[PDB]
Design a protein around this ligand. Sequence first.
Ligand code: HEC
Ligand code: HEC
Lengths: 82, 80
Amino acid sequence: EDPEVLFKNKGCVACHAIDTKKVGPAYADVAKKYAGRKDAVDYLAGKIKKGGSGVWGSVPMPPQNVTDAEAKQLAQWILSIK
Amino acid sequence: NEQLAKQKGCMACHDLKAKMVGPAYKDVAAKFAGQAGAEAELAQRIKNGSQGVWGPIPMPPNAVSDDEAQTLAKWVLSQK
Ligand code: HEC
Ligand code: HEC
């Protein structure tokens, strides 16, 4: 049988995928961490624009080319992924 | 929104979804690259389960034949 087929029908698909995780946190995980956390939108908007490090690992997010309004919109969207 | 995130390059460094509990096959292929006996060792781990390699959660045995385990091992190690 083809491995792609076995990968699905023998349950491997419940626990494994092909591609590695990207360097930053998954947005679903960001949403979960900050749900109900007071000031999450403004906190995250600040991090998106300014960059930062140390919350999820030692790899930094560089400062991002977004307006304050865009940073807030992006924070709000990320927090909705739940 | 999602479209703004894509345009701004955010998705280069961020996935929408969390990782699965086990390691990604492209990472397994890279880890075993240039290791003697990789194919046979991986077939055994797929069949019999394994632990302590990637994290604290073991992989249980899988109900695969010897031939199926070898096929899967070779396919995993080829993911480039
Ligand atoms: C494009 C404008 C975006 C948006 C909307 C976000 N990012 Fe990143 N990001 C990266 C890394 C390595 C981290 C972890 C930093 C740490 O450990 O502290 C992050 C983190 C985030 C967060 C969470 C911030 C927090 O303090 O919890 C959020 C909301 C976020 N990002 C949004 C890495 C990168 C990149 C790598 C080159 C790029 C590009 C971006 N991020 C871009 C964006
Ligand atoms: C179905 C037949 C498959 C196949 C082809 C593979 N798995 Fe898993 N797997 C899981 C976990 C948690 C690990 C890591 C355990 C540890 O930390 O030691 C693994 C590991 C593997 C590997 C890599 C082996 C290595 O030593 O590097 C490979 C190639 C692999 N798996 C293939 C978790 C799960 C599952 C969770 C319940 C299930 C189901 C499977 N794996 C099934 C399969």
